[PDB]
Amino acid sequence: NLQNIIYNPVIPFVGTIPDQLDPGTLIVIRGHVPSDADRFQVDLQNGSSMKPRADVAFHFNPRFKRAGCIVCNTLINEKWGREEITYDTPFKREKSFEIVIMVLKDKFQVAVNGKHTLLYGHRIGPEKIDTLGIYGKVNIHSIGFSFSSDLQ
Ligand code: NA
């Protein structure tokens, strides 16, 4: 089962991820998109500073204008790289969602609402990730984690 759970956080949320992001690690984020949303993002970061801004290994950015999309990217030394855009977005204003990010050796895999959504190859070594940030127009119900070290 998921552990290290956070309930109903204030957004923006910035929290230390409780263990290393080894292959098989799961980050599970349940929430809903508010009626007025333009975009939100989930960022897996190397550090927590907002200024100068911490590197973002994996930026997962649902956008809601027109037909919507999900933009993924990486921020290194305050510069964004090439966007990878997934156009068939499952997210909808006023609807709840579950995001499951799984770390693999060479990429992240993301499923939304129980269906595979996208892959994103590592551009920063995942061992450098220590922080989860959630920003923008989104209402988070819970955040939970699964690590290979979890006891039960
Ligand atoms: Na940003």
Residue numbers in the entry: 14 to 165
What did the authors write?
The best structure, structure 1, allowed 152 residues (Asn7 to Gln158) to be identified with 1.08 Å resolution. This is the best resolution for the Gal-8 N CRD available to date. Electron density of the first four residues in the linker region (Ser154 to Gln158) was clear, indicating that this part of linker forms stable secondary structure under conditions of our crystallization. In structure 1, four residues (Asn7, Gln9, Asp156, and Gln158) were seen to interact with each other via ionic interactions and hydrogen bonds. Surprisingly, crystal structure 1 made using the first condition has space group P212121, and not C2, and the carbohydrate binding site binds glycerol and not lactose. This structure was solved with the crystal being soaked in 20% (v/v) glycerol for approximately 1 min prior to data collection. In structure 1, glycerol was found to replace lactose in the carbohydrate binding site. In our crystal structure, the C and O atoms of glycerol occupy the same positions as C4, C5, C6 and O1, O4, O6 atoms of galactose in the lactose-bound structure. Interestingly, glycerol was found to substitute lactose at the carbohydrate binding site in 1.08 Å structure, however, because the hemagglutination assay showed that glycerol did not inhibit Gal-8 N-mediated agglutination, this ligand could not be physiologically relevant.
